[PDB]
C-alpha cells in the first residue's frame, strides 16, 4: 500500500518511465495497479516582449508539471530488491508516500 509518485516536464518521458515501472512489476506477474492520471500543474507567465515599451505585445509561457502515481500494493521480493535502475532518466522526480 506504498505509493510511488512521479513528476516530470516531459509526458512522454514520464509515461515511458511508468511503463517500464509497470512492466517490471508485471514481468513475472502480480496484482499491481497501473499509474493514475493525477492532474498536471500548469505555471503560466505573461511577460513583456519589448525591452522599452509594450501596449498589446506580450509573450505567454507555460510549464506543465505532469504527475503520476503507481501505488504498488503487492509485495514481491525481486521487485523490492531490483525496482531501482530501471528507467535511468534524469528528468524524473521521484517521491514515496504511505
Amino acid at each position: 500500500r506504498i505509493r510511488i509518485r512521479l513528476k516530470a516536464f516531459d509526458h512522454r518521458l514520464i509515461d515511458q518511465a511508468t511503463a517500464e515501472i509497470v512492466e517490471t512489476a508485471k514481468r513475472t506477474g502480480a496484482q499491481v495497479r497501473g499509474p493514475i492520471p493525477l492532474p498536471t500543474r500548469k505555471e503560466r507567465f505573461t511577460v513583456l516582449i519589448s525591452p522599452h515599451v509594450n501596449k498589446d505585445a506580450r509573450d505567454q509561457y507555460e510549464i506543465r508539471t505532469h504527475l503520476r502515481l503507481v501505488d504498488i500494493v503487492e509485495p514481491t521480493e525481486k521487485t523490492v530488491d531490483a525496482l531501482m535502475r530501471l528507467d535511468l532518466a534524469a528528468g524524473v522526480d521521484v517521491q514515496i508516500s504511505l
Binding site: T46, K55, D56, A57, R58, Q60
Partner: protein, 127 residues
Amino acid sequence: NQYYGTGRRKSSAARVFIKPGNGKIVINQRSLEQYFGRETARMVVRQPLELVDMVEKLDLYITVKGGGISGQAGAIRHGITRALMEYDESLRSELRKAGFVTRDARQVERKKVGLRKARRRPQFSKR
C-alpha cells in the same frame, strides 16, 4: 435496468440514470422545485420530456456538477437527450428535428492581452 445519459453545457456535467417508474425526478438529492424550480430556466429540463409527452412513464435520477444554474439545466436536458438516444433512433430523429441532440459548442472566450475583456478593446482617443 438503467438508462444513462451524460450531457454537457460548457461548464456543467451531469449523469442521468433512469429506471422505468414514477414520474417524480430528483437532482442532487433534492427535487427539481427544491433545487431550481423557483429559479429561471426551469422548462428546459421539461422540454425533452414534454416534446414526446411522457410524464409518469419513467423515473429519473440526475447528479449535476459545475457551472451555474442554466448550465446545470442545459446539462440535465442534454443528459435526458442521451438517455433518449439510448432509447431509440426514431426519437433521435425527432429530437434532431427539434434541436436538442447537439451538444452546445459555445464555451466562454479567453481573456486576451491588450484587451479589457475577451473581445472588448480599450478605448483610445482620436489624438
